[PDB]
């Protein structure tokens, strides 16, 4: 982290002095270039070293539409973002911050790129909340809850729950076989 910060500062100073500045000494230019290259190599090494945390995090989300490799790549993007914003002064380990950012990136990507008809995240959260409330009511009552109970417990109109349930369906495939043998298609 210190090497990355030093390299970034050296690159910024070199860029600032390049335009509207003065002729930097050759030794100073060489030192700045070496510091920048060392910072880049350190950042690459830090990214490569923690590529297994992404795989560990993305294992739990397998089977929810997104492919395993896509989850790994989104976790890698989250890991890059975490590396960019990691601060060593507080002294906390990089694992916690990396886990937070990887989880955020995977959740956001799986919320967006997992449905043929896209649903915004601000409504995916509402759908998840409605599902949780429905499960809780089903457990408490002992029978399938009515839309009136869901509306009462979700402080919404009895019409919004129906719309939310309508938005939750997924398109079927036209190429699926209808009969026992593969001679007819939907």
């Amino acid at each position: 982290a210190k090497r990355i910060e030093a390299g970034l500062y050296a690159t910024q100073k070199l860029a600032e002095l390049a335009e509207k500045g003065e002729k930097l000494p050759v030794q100073q230019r060489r030192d700045m270039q070496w510091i920048c290259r060392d910072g880049d190599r350190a950042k690459n090494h830090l990214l490569e070293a923690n590529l297994r945390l992404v795989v560990s995090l993305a294992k739990r989300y397998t089977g929810r539409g997104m492919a395993f490799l896509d989850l790994i790549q989104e976790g890698n993007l989250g890991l890059i973002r975490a590396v960019e914003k990691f601060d060593y002064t507080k002294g906390y380990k990089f694992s916690t911050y990396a886990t937070w950012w990887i989880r955020q990136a995977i959740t956001r990507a799986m919320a967006d790129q997992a449905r043929t008809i896209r649903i915004p995240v601000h409504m995916v959260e509402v759908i998840n909340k409605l599902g949780r409330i429905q499960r809780e009511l089903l457990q408490d009552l002992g029978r399938e809850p009515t839309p009136e109970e869901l509306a009462k417990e979700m402080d919404i109109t009895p019409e919004k729950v129906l719309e939310i349930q309508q938005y939750a369906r997924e398109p079927i495939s036209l190429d699926q076989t209808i009969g026992d043998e593969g001679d007819s298609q939907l």
């Binding site: 790549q73 890698n76 993007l77 369906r169 398109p171 079927i172 495939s173």
Partner: protein, 195 residues
């Protein structure tokens, strides 16, 4: 690369194949194959025959071998992959939209990774995923395992559209459903004439 950097240039992936095809010399290869086939003998003769066949096919015509490496992937018109709403509000896809979405998602992620400056491992993995997605789009099942949708059903690609008894040629070109047609049970009538 670290020691003898300024002595060779090696790559990995489809870019290297494209560069090799660019540096390929059709005339010299054809002449060498003709010399081998007219001079040599043995097991090498069959391979020389086959390579001469392929090179002559690529040379006699006006085309170039650069068509084997793609830079743009065409998109089928929407009416051939309809998104219809069945009775009851349920929608239906043609199983090509999923493949196109996967290809576009992987291409956009590759663009973002290149823009950010990701290390070589991640970029190479993304490029391999893009290659696999395109290969599955053009022909699903040739390499690796088929892409499976809901219900563990392999998706149907363009090659599957053009192949089999359910393909276009044998189901909608050589045999069609016609109007002004009927069907009923047959009985025996002896009082009828022969016509």
């Amino acid at each position: 690369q670290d020691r003898y950097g300024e002595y060779f240039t090696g790559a990995m992936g489809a870019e290297s194949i494209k560069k090799l095809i660019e540096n390929f010399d059709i005339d010299a290869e054809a002449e060498s194959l003709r010399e081998v086939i007219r001079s040599g003998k043995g097991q090498k003769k069959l391979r020389a025959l086959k390579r001469l066949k392929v090179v002559a096919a690529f040379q006699q015509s006006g085309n170039s071998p650069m068509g084997m490496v793609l830079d743009a992937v065409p998109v089928i018109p929407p009416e051939l992959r309809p998104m219809v709403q069945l009775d009851g509000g349920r929608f239906a896809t043609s199983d090509l939209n999923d493949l196109y979405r996967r290809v576009i998602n992987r291409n956009n992620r590759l663009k973002r990774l290149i823009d950010l400056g990701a290390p070589e491992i991640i970029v190479n993995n993304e490029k391999r995923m893009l290659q696999e997605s395109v290969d599955a789009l053009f022909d699903n099942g040739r390499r690796g395992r088929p892409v499976t949708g809901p219900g563990n059903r392999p998706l149907k690609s363009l090659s599957d559209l053009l192949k089999g008894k359910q393909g276009r040629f044998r189901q909608n070109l050589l045999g069609k459903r016609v109007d002004y047609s009927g069907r009923s049970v047959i009985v025996v009538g002896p009082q009828l004439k022969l016509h």
